[PDB]
Scaffold this active site. Structure first.
Site, PDB file in Angstrom:
ATOM      1  NE  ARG A 131     -28.228  13.434  -1.807  1.00  0.00           N
ATOM      2  CZ  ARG A 131     -27.540  14.517  -1.443  1.00  0.00           C
ATOM      3  NH1 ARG A 131     -28.158  15.633  -1.081  1.00  0.00           N
ATOM      4  NH2 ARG A 131     -26.209  14.483  -1.460  1.00  0.00           N
ATOM      5  CG  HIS A 177     -27.054   9.594   1.020  1.00  0.00           C
ATOM      6  ND1 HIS A 177     -26.063  10.440   0.570  1.00  0.00           N
ATOM      7  CD2 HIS A 177     -27.709   9.160  -0.084  1.00  0.00           C
ATOM      8  CE1 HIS A 177     -26.133  10.532  -0.745  1.00  0.00           C
ATOM      9  NE2 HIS A 177     -27.120   9.764  -1.167  1.00  0.00           N
ATOM     10  CG  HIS A 222     -32.780   8.557  -8.638  1.00  0.00           C
ATOM     11  ND1 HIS A 222     -31.691   7.933  -9.211  1.00  0.00           N
ATOM     12  CD2 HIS A 222     -32.385   8.948  -7.405  1.00  0.00           C
ATOM     13  CE1 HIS A 222     -30.683   7.953  -8.358  1.00  0.00           C
ATOM     14  NE2 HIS A 222     -31.077   8.561  -7.252  1.00  0.00           N
ATOM     15  CD1 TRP A 248     -32.829  10.281 -12.743  1.00  0.00           C
ATOM     16  CD2 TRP A 248     -33.141  11.619 -10.974  1.00  0.00           C
ATOM     17  NE1 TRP A 248     -31.676  10.277 -12.006  1.00  0.00           N
ATOM     18  CE2 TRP A 248     -31.837  11.084 -10.912  1.00  0.00           C
ATOM     19  CE3 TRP A 248     -33.575  12.474  -9.949  1.00  0.00           C
ATOM     20  CZ2 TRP A 248     -30.947  11.399  -9.884  1.00  0.00           C
ATOM     21  CZ3 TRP A 248     -32.693  12.786  -8.922  1.00  0.00           C
ATOM     22  CH2 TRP A 248     -31.391  12.245  -8.897  1.00  0.00           C
ATOM     23  CG  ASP A 260     -30.227   7.106 -13.048  1.00  0.00           C
ATOM     24  OD1 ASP A 260     -30.556   6.552 -11.973  1.00  0.00           O
ATOM     25  OD2 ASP A 260     -30.038   8.338 -13.142  1.00  0.00           O
TER      26      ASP A 260
HETATM   27  C1  HEM Z   1     -28.555   3.391  -7.224  1.00  0.00           C
HETATM   28  C2  HEM Z   1     -27.499   4.103  -6.797  1.00  0.00           C
HETATM   29  C3  HEM Z   1     -27.670   5.615  -6.533  1.00  0.00           C
HETATM   30  C4  HEM Z   1     -26.937   6.603  -7.051  1.00  0.00           C
HETATM   31  C5  HEM Z   1     -25.739   6.460  -8.009  1.00  0.00           C
HETATM   32  C6  HEM Z   1     -27.467   7.851  -6.555  1.00  0.00           C
HETATM   33  C7  HEM Z   1     -26.997   9.106  -6.840  1.00  0.00           C
HETATM   34  C8  HEM Z   1     -27.667  10.284  -6.591  1.00  0.00           C
HETATM   35  C9  HEM Z   1     -27.200  11.604  -6.942  1.00  0.00           C
HETATM   36  C10 HEM Z   1     -25.854  11.902  -7.647  1.00  0.00           C
HETATM   37  C11 HEM Z   1     -28.123  12.486  -6.543  1.00  0.00           C
HETATM   38  C12 HEM Z   1     -28.079  14.016  -6.701  1.00  0.00           C
HETATM   39  C13 HEM Z   1     -27.690  14.730  -5.411  1.00  0.00           C
HETATM   40  C14 HEM Z   1     -27.779  16.213  -5.664  1.00  0.00           C
HETATM   41  O1  HEM Z   1     -26.989  16.729  -6.500  1.00  0.00           O
HETATM   42  O2  HEM Z   1     -28.636  16.896  -5.044  1.00  0.00           O
HETATM   43  C15 HEM Z   1     -29.203  11.749  -5.940  1.00  0.00           C
HETATM   44  C16 HEM Z   1     -30.351  12.301  -5.425  1.00  0.00           C
HETATM   45  C17 HEM Z   1     -31.421  11.612  -4.913  1.00  0.00           C
HETATM   46  N1  HEM Z   1     -31.410  10.272  -4.548  1.00  0.00           N
HETATM   47 FE1  HEM Z   1     -30.071   8.893  -5.350  1.00  0.00          FE
HETATM   48  N2  HEM Z   1     -28.536   7.576  -5.733  1.00  0.00           N
HETATM   49  C18 HEM Z   1     -28.684   6.209  -5.691  1.00  0.00           C
HETATM   50  C19 HEM Z   1     -29.615   5.544  -4.939  1.00  0.00           C
HETATM   51  C20 HEM Z   1     -30.707   6.095  -4.313  1.00  0.00           C
HETATM   52  C21 HEM Z   1     -31.647   5.374  -3.485  1.00  0.00           C
HETATM   53  C22 HEM Z   1     -31.506   3.878  -3.113  1.00  0.00           C
HETATM   54  C23 HEM Z   1     -32.589   6.248  -3.108  1.00  0.00           C
HETATM   55  C24 HEM Z   1     -33.825   6.003  -2.228  1.00  0.00           C
HETATM   56  C25 HEM Z   1     -34.636   4.977  -2.505  1.00  0.00           C
HETATM   57  C26 HEM Z   1     -32.271   7.527  -3.692  1.00  0.00           C
HETATM   58  C27 HEM Z   1     -33.005   8.678  -3.572  1.00  0.00           C
HETATM   59  C28 HEM Z   1     -32.654   9.915  -4.044  1.00  0.00           C
HETATM   60  C29 HEM Z   1     -33.535  11.049  -4.103  1.00  0.00           C
HETATM   61  C30 HEM Z   1     -35.008  11.099  -3.681  1.00  0.00           C
HETATM   62  C31 HEM Z   1     -32.721  12.181  -4.668  1.00  0.00           C
HETATM   63  C32 HEM Z   1     -33.193  13.613  -4.943  1.00  0.00           C
HETATM   64  C33 HEM Z   1     -32.737  14.516  -3.809  1.00  0.00           C
HETATM   65  C34 HEM Z   1     -33.278  15.919  -3.974  1.00  0.00           C
HETATM   66  O3  HEM Z   1     -34.246  16.137  -4.750  1.00  0.00           O
HETATM   67  O4  HEM Z   1     -32.722  16.825  -3.307  1.00  0.00           O
HETATM   68  N3  HEM Z   1     -31.112   7.407  -4.424  1.00  0.00           N
HETATM   69  N4  HEM Z   1     -28.900  10.406  -5.982  1.00  0.00           N
END
Ligand code: HEM
Ligand code: HEM
Ligand code: NA
Ligand code: NA
Ligand code: NA
Ligand code: NA
EC number: 1.11.1.11
Lengths: 248, 248
Positions: A37, A41, A162, A178, A207
């Site tokens: 993440r 970001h 995710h 997820w 998603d």
């Molecule tokens: C496609 C558009 C995307 C949206 C709308 C999105 C949105 C989010 C949201 C809302 C969270 C939850 C944050 C939290 O409450 O802790 C999250 C977590 C996460 N995102 Fe995405 N994200 C996107 C793209 C990506 C991309 C491109 C990656 C990397 C390839 C990614 C990797 C992750 C990972 C690994 C988490 C889990 C973090 C944790 O376990 O603390 N995301 N994302």
């Protein structure tokens, strides 16, 4: 379209040693998804039209960490500081992208190619460029396509990130993993998307948008059916993401 | 002295996929040290004079797991069974040695070269060939040198495997970790050996034997001073261990 810069032998030696230390640290701390993440970001603020933002170390700035979409990433930055200090020669930009590559590897994902040489830039990009979980396909294309310059294939493959981790009600407000195995990188994100909403698993509106878009849906189907194809497209997309604005 | 056998493209594809799945599994389960111990106990039964024992899958047999020195390794075998079943083409021998290589990698250690092709053999070797923690340098040479065919350098480098993990009073009877970071592979085993007995850290009589032997001690000093040198010698030794009796 990439012409990677030359870095010294000492720099490359530090990359290799840092990669090892990051494996051990990330595995022990169980923070792979948080680090992925962080890397996403950091990179995801790139705007191709202005050549602003991207993976240039600005996410370490308290001002960027304060961005709403970055809730909790201060933890990631803090976790990495002691290790980063063991590698003073490395840019923060390279270190964070290397951490993202390692996060995918240690959880069993593909080996994403890594090229060093990102320079740390002084000014964070404007807030509001990162993807919005409450919106759909048009907005995904605005962010990943119009701003970042990535393809529709890249959007779906990267959404598969995710497959590791979870949302937190204190961070985004969404809550839970997820997948049934949030520290295992596999194609389960897509399998879960197709089966419907199973008890205790999260699906964001962003998603769900993949299932009803004419271009995104065939990709979801492909990745659900063929993990090898997902891994190939994921590695391609993650590399591109990690290199936005870098080496052209 | 090695002539590695040919394996099919499908076999090699399974090795690569299994390596990834093992990374994710071992990291998530926090079982790297147990898996390294499994790989070492599998390989460490080799006797060069008779060409018996070694890393040929026999440690999966309840009869070999029942060996006193193998207390707790039934857990390791059980943990790996579901994943092994996803790779029916692989020998157990290759799978266990790959798990050992992955255990070192995911904890931040060197990348130990891996060559497939070990065949699963029908009969476990006789009990009593594995190293004795209560004995010293003469016995280490009997086991690693006279039986396995490894060098004095290999003995000291491989002893550094104790940089990950811990003893258990219900298994060997000894208790606790050798290092302050038992899921991090670094040269700390040697640093701790030199500083004396710090509170809460384990030193076996067999570890202490390294400090007073004329050949082993300079190696301890080297590894404590130079982690890169330790990693190089460790990778060499682990590869040799994992290949005893295999491909010559
Ligand atoms: C496609 C558009 C995307 C949206 C709308 C999105 C949105 C989010 C949201 C809302 C969270 C939850 C944050 C939290 O409450 O802790 C999250 C977590 C996460 N995102 Fe995405 N994200 C996107 C793209 C990506 C991309 C491109 C990656 C990397 C390839 C990614 C990797 C992750 C990972 C690994 C988490 C889990 C973090 C944790 O376990 O603390 N995301 N994302
Ligand atoms: C040099 C002679 C050796 C002796 C005397 C020895 C002895 C022992 C003993 C008594 C234990 C504790 C078992 C328990 O109570 O759980 C142990 C654990 C362990 N051994 Fe060694 N061993 C030797 C060599 C090796 C080698 C060559 C390796 C691999 C390179 C290795 C890797 C490990 C690991 C990683 C553990 C921790 C297991 C865990 O955390 O569950 N050892 N060893
Ligand atoms: Na960054
Ligand atoms: Na998962
Ligand atoms: Na074995
Ligand atoms: Na350690």
């Amino acid at each position: 379209g990439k012409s990677y810069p030359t870095v010294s032998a000492d720099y490359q030696k530090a990359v290799e040693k840092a990669k090892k230390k990051l494996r051990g640290f990330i595995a022990e701390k169980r923070c792979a998804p948080l680090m992925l993440r962080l890397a996403a970001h950091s990179a995801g603020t790139f705007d191709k039209g202005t050549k602003t933002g991207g993976p240039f170390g600005t996410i370490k700035h308290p001002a960027e960490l304060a961005h709403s979409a970055n809730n909790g990433l201060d933890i990631a930055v803090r976790l990495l500081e002691p290790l980063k200090a063991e590698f003073p020669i490395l840019s923060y930009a390279d270190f964070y992208q290397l951490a993202g590559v390692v996060a995918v590897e240690v959880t069993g994902g593909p080996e994403v190619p890594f090229h060093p040489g990102r320079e740390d830039k002084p000014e964070p990009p404007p807030e509001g460029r990162l993807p919005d979980a409450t919106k759909g396909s048009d907005h995904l294309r605005d962010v990943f396509g119009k701003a970042m310059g990535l393809t529709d294939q890249d959007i779906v493959a990267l959404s598969g990130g995710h497959t590791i981790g979870a949302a937190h009600k204190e961070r985004s407000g969404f809550e839970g993993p997820w997948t049934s195995n949030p520290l295992i990188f596999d194609n389960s994100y897509f399998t879960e998307l197709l089966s419907g909403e199973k008890e205790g698993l999260l699906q964001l509106p962003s998603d769900k948008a993949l299932l009803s878009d004419p271009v995104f849906r065939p990709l979801v189907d492909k990745y659900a059916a063929d993990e090898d194809a997902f891994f190939a497209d994921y590695a391609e997309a993650h590399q591109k993401l990690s290199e936005l604005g870098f080496a052209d």
